[PDB]
Design a protein around this ligand. Sequence first.
Ligand SMILES: O=C(Nc1ccccc1C(=O)O)c1cccc(S(=O)(=O)N2CCc3ccccc3C2)c1
Ligand SMILES: O=C(Nc1ccccc1C(=O)O)c1cccc(S(=O)(=O)N2CCc3ccccc3C2)c1
Lengths: 257, 255
Amino acid sequence: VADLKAFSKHIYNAYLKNFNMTKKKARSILTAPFVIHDIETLWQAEKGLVWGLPPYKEISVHVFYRCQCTTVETVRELTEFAKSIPSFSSLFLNDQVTLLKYGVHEAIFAMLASIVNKDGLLVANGSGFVTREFLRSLRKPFSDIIEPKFEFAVKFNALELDDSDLALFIAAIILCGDRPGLMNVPRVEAIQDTILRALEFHLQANHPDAQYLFPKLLQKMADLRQLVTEHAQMMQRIKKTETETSLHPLLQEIYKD
Amino acid sequence: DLKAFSKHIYNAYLKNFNMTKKKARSILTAPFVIHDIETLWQAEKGLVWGLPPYKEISVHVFYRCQCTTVETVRELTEFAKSIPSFSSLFLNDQVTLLKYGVHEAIFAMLASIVNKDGLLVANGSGFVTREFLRSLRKPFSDIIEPKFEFAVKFNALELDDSDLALFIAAIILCGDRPGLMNVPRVEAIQDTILRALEFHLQANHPDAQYLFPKLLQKMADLRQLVTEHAQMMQRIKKTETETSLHPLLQEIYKD
Ligand SMILES: O=C(Nc1ccccc1C(=O)O)c1cccc(S(=O)(=O)N2CCc3ccccc3C2)c1
Ligand SMILES: O=C(Nc1ccccc1C(=O)O)c1cccc(S(=O)(=O)N2CCc3ccccc3C2)c1
């Protein structure tokens, strides 16, 4: 219980040091950003009011490129976050990459819930708010990509986790010993079990009255697996049917499996 | 900007490697001499030094080479990370560079702990004789011999630690590695290292002609060396099935 109070605080610092957008910062904004709800307001957002990119093609593809850019920026933040966990950094560099490779999207979808409400999501570091309605209005198969992440984000936010809960949840997602090609599995498993025990102790103190919060959270991790799988499946469809669209090499690398 | 860069790398080098060429040369000019089974046994029992379960002598030496190789991969990983431009690459690119670079780097650094007669082991405490390494049974005797051949020809160039620092950095930040994600960037960093190395060789070795191009040729030689090493490790994995290879080395010899 004592080594676990310490551990949790250490991770919460790695979290606060490395992510530009916390749930605390986001909730206070969501309760002014510039609302992007159509082409005119998107054009206005670009021209200064909110914001290099691959050459212009069309609006649904443009949004698709901005999602990729945001995804990459978050992979960096997550990379720096993980490295800030001493036990992570003491793994072999090839194992670090394996964990990140299979972990990042699950983590990204987990953190998305922080910047989301029923109506849309905060973009460009809180400067803008893209409406969910506008994202459904994009042509197929681009409209299909973001919609399930929303569905998930609403159900997730109902658990009312704060940044210190998320810190440990994210760390658990990344330091997960079931990843294929993992070199030193027992070690990764050991570190995970510590994170999970820490998370669980932390949930008791931080949420005294919330029942079943820990097992519900574990189920959320299973859900994120299904989410990422379904994401990968859709990116295959874009790579095949939308050959004119281009995918950032780092995402190509991740989606490869 | 190149005087600065070189000094920065020389610090990463001195901070990260336990055995420099200066430290080695002064020892090689007392370590405990391992030249046979009795002196190997004596070296183990305290006089010099977990491992995989005992099998036989040629395999034991083979396990100690693996252990040393792994420890150096760590030192090299920390060394490279100590280059800001390296650390600013994507983590998957860092791993690619290290994957294909380390063995070339290891064989380059080996020359520092080697003379005609043998090599310094266990952080300078011991000296294993070349003769004893030839005396090991096949295919284990074949593994180390070419690295020696290379190390003698290499030491003739009389490089100091500050030359090696930049040479190693060049070996690692090499943009010709397969599966490299951001090639132009890696190439840009390399060219800086190579320009630095070249400027540094003029100042550090005013009279040595053709030292820079000869060094470039040494990098091509190391490629051939590593290729031939990989080929031999395939033979041990296939014919010596009872022998075990460290998982990290299994990863590197794969592709
Ligand atoms: O909707 C989003 N962003 C935007 C939407 C509209 C306009 C601008 C942006 C932006 O973030 O710049 C948005 C943000 C964060 C996350 C997401 S997502 O739906 O979780 N995302 C992550 C993985 C991924 C990988 C490849 C392609 C698309 C995606 C989609 C969307
Ligand atoms: O000769 C050496 N080591 C020893 C030999 C005898 C006894 C002890 C040691 C020791 O290093 O402790 C030795 C040291 C450092 C390097 C080398 S090596 O020949 O460059 N080495 C590196 C790659 C590799 C990978 C897998 C298997 C073998 C090898 C061969 C040998």
